[PDB]
Amino acid sequence: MFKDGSLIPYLTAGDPDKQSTLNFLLALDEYAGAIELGIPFSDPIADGKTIQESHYRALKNGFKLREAFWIVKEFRRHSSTPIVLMTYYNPIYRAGVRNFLAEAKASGVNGILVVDLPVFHAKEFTEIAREEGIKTVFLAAPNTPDERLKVIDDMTTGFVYLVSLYGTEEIPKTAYDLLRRAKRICRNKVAVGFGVSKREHVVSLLKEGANGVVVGSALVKIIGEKGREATEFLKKKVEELLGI
């Protein structure tokens, strides 16, 4: 869904408020190949500490599901940068899969990633996303075996998202191994979320085959640190990571 060598910002919707999220997106668009907008959930057990706290902040400050669409809709007035909505299944399941996907599409969302999509529902889910015109983004971690990478690649219409809960401040070998295994199996492009925080992390991951590098934690840390005034500091971090 994005150009090779793309940096992909990840932000939690409504952290600290939907208006600020929109501001952050507009300020980082010029550096983004695509953007991941995360829907906050009460139990983000698949996320790292930093991003879990951004979920807590957003909910505490009163974030509401459809405010995420507001953000995408307003963003679309100024940009056509691909947007992937990242969420836990619970919200979608409760609101109605097709209803949510249709509403997502209508707002400008291009793809969707369901962090904990029950394998039991994967089939029907992908079929519904296809019908609603939304591309799919599936996740895989270091403990994902080659056989499953293949199944994941065959269902993916957007791009494969490789993650690493490991942390760092070096990228773990187990994370590089996941990438190395994925590029050998995936026909889809792949993005990596290995918690980069330094220029060398980006240069290296791109050199090792990542079509796109996502930047979430580095940005979110600054947001829970500077609140609405995070913007300018975010631009500098993304610039640092881009060697500019």
Swiss-Prot record:
Documented EC number(s): 4.2.1.20
One example GO MF annotation: tryptophan synthase activity
CDD domains: Tryptophan_synthase_alpha
Domain of life: Archaea
GO cellular component: cytosol
Family membership noted in the UniProt record: Belongs to the TrpA family.
Function: The alpha subunit is responsible for the aldol cleavage of indoleglycerol phosphate to indole and glyceraldehyde 3-phosphate.
Protein name: Tryptophan synthase alpha chain
Organism: Pyrococcus furiosus (strain ATCC 43587 / DSM 3638 / JCM 8422 / Vc1)
